[PDB]
Structures are given as C-alpha cells and as structure tokens.
Amino acid sequence: GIVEQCCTSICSLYQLENYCN
Amino acid sequence: GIVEQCCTSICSLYQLENYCN
Amino acid sequence: GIVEQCCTSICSLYQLENYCN
Amino acid sequence: GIVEQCCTSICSLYQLENYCN
Amino acid sequence: GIVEQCCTSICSLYQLENYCN
Amino acid sequence: FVNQHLCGSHLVEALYLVCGE
Amino acid sequence: FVNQHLCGSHLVEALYLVCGE
Amino acid sequence: FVNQHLCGSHLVEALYLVCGE
Amino acid sequence: FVNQHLCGSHLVEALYLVCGE
Amino acid sequence: FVNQHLCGSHLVEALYLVCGE
Secondary structure, X not given: XXXXXXXXXXXXXXXXXXXXX | OEEXXXXXXXXXXXXXXXXXX | OXXXXXXXXXXXXXXXXXXXX | OEEEEEOOOEEEEXXXXXXXX | OEEEEXXXXXXXXXXXXXXXX | OEEEXXXXXXXXXXXXEEEOO | OXXXXXXXXXXXXXXXXXXXX | OEEEXXXXXXXXXXXXXXXXX | OXXXXXXXXXXXXXXXXXXXX | OEEEEEOOEEXXXXXXXXOOO
C-alpha cells in the first residue's frame, strides 16, 4: 500500500507494488 | 518500505526495493 | 536501510544495499 | 555501516563496504 | 574502521581496509 | 509500504517494490 | 527501509535494495 | 545501514553495501 | 564502520572495506 | 583502525590496511 498527503504542494509520485502472491 | 517527508522543498527521490520472496 | 535528513541543503546521495538473502 | 554529518560544508564522500557473507 | 572529523578544513583522505575474513 | 507527506514544490518520488527476485 | 526527511532545495536520493545476490 | 544528516551545500555521499563477496 | 563529521570546505573521504582477501 | 582529526588546509592522508600477507 501507499499513502500520499499533500497540502500546499505540487506532487508527482509513482508507486508500483508487485507481489509474489 | 520507504517514507518521504518534504516541507519547504523540491524533492527528487528514487527508492526501489527488490526482495527475494 | 538508509536514512537521509536535510535541512537547509542541496543533497545528492546514492545508497545501494545488496544482500545475500 | 557509514554515517555522514555535515553542517556548513560541501561534502564529497564515497564509502563502499563489501562483506564476505 | 575509519573516522574523519574536519572543522575549518579542506580534507582529502583515502582509507582502504582489506581483511582476511 | 510507502508513506509520503508533501507540503512543498515539485515532489518527485518513485517507489518500486517487488518480490520474487 | 528508507527514511527521508527533506526541507531544502534539490534533494536527490537514490535507494536500491535487493536480496538474492 | 547508512545515516546521513546534511545541512549544507552540495552533499555528495555514495554508499555501496554488498555481501556475498 | 565509518564515522564522518564534516563542517568545512571540500571534504573528500574515500572508504573501501572488504573481507575475503 | 584510523583516527583522523583535521582542522587545517589540505590534509592528505592515505591509509592502506590489509591482512593475509
């Protein structure tokens, strides 16, 4: 899981999670 | 896992975690 | 694991950890 | 492990640790 | 292990430790 | 697991997590 | 495991973690 | 294990850790 | 094991640690 | 084991430690 919290921001995030099973 | 916290910043981070199983 | 903390800074760090198992 | 602490500095450090197992 | 501490300095150090096992 | 809290300008974070390697 | 706290200008951190080596 | 605390200008740290050598 | 504390101008430290020699 | 404390101009120290000779 990922959690992004931006207040006064310009946010550019890429979060990729690949799991076995 | 990774955790990024930026206040008054321009942040450029790349965190890659590859695990056995 | 690695931990970077920058206040009034321009930081350029590369930390790579390769473990047996 | 390595630990770098720079206050009013320009720091250029390279620390490489290769262990048996 | 090595430990470098520089205050008002320009430091140029190379410390290499190669151990049997 | 990725926790990102941004409150600034141009926050670029790239997370890649994978098991099975 | 990567903990990054930035509050400055141009924070470039690269983390690569992998087991199975 | 890498602990980096920077509060200056142009902090270049390179960490390479590996076991299995 | 490398402990580096810098508070100056142009701190160049090179650490190379390896066992299995 | 190398302990270096510098507070001057142009500190050039070269340490080479190795066992197995």
